[PDB]
């Protein structure tokens, strides 16, 4: 996987907004690739981190983990720089054994992306009311 620019069209509630993300390199302590918002100022931009973890003597199986965060900026009065008011998170962790095939993991990925567009999840996430 080559870290490139990621363009996401037709996202948001109305299906009109886009999002262009630029790579920010891997973190050599923990191997987590990062991506941020085009434009920016740092500590006010939308971040996407992706890591992939290999089994060792501590953990038996593979683990793919995605953590995305994005803040809300409020321009205060008498100030020249906006501040972060609240933040919204999401983080997916996939766990797969060492004998899983390609079709299975593509099925889990595609099942999750298809479930994030069902009215069960549209009504669980946008409005915060569970299934009755």
């Amino acid at each position: 996987a080559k870290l490139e620019t990621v363009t996401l069209g037709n996202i948001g509630k109305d299906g009109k907004q886009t999002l262009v993300l630029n790579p920010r390199g891997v973190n050599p302590t923990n191997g987590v690739a990062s991506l941020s918002q085009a434009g920016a100022v740092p500590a006010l931009e939308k971040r996407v981190t992706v890591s992939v973890s290999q089994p060792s003597r501590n953990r038996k199986n593979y683990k793919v983990q995605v953590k995305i965060q994005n803040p809300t900026a409020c321009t205060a009065n008498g100030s020249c720089d906006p501040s972060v008011t609240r933040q919204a998170y999401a983080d997916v962790t996939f766990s797969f054994t060492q004998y899983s095939t390609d079709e299975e993991r593509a099925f889990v990925r595609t099942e999750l992306a298809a479930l994030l567009a069902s009215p069960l999840l549209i009504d669980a996430i946008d409005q915060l009311n569970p299934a009755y």
Partner: protein
């Protein structure tokens, strides 16, 4: 959900493509459908996920639109494509239908 339709009568009958629009009160997240009621009485399903055709549609019909404003285009109109068209949402459990535009 109230599926309001604006023009209520489409007068074009030859040639160039025609545009028939709908409006939802809320946002319905591409769960919008399209129907065709011939004056013989039969009703046909055309488009169900705002861009996905039914198995007996010759791709003269095509839909688009997102958010609240959805649309349907008919390139190369013919004399068998004159009816009243209804749009309806599949997002919420009441499943209200639209008004109707007569070709």
């Amino acid at each position: 959900i109230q599926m309001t339709q604006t023009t209520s009568s489409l007068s074009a009958s030859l040639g160039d493509r025609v545009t028939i629009t709908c409006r939802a009160s809320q946002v319905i997240s591409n769960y919008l459908n399209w129907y065709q009621q011939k004056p013989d009485g039969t009703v046909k399903l055309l488009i169900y996920y705002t861009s996905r055709l039914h198995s007996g549609v010759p791709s003269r019909f095509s839909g688009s639109g997102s958010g609240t404003d959805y649309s349907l285009t008919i390139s190369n109109l013919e004399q068998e494509d004159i009816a009243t068209y209804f749009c309806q949402q599949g997002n919420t459990l009441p499943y209200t239908f639209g008004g109707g535009t007569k070709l």
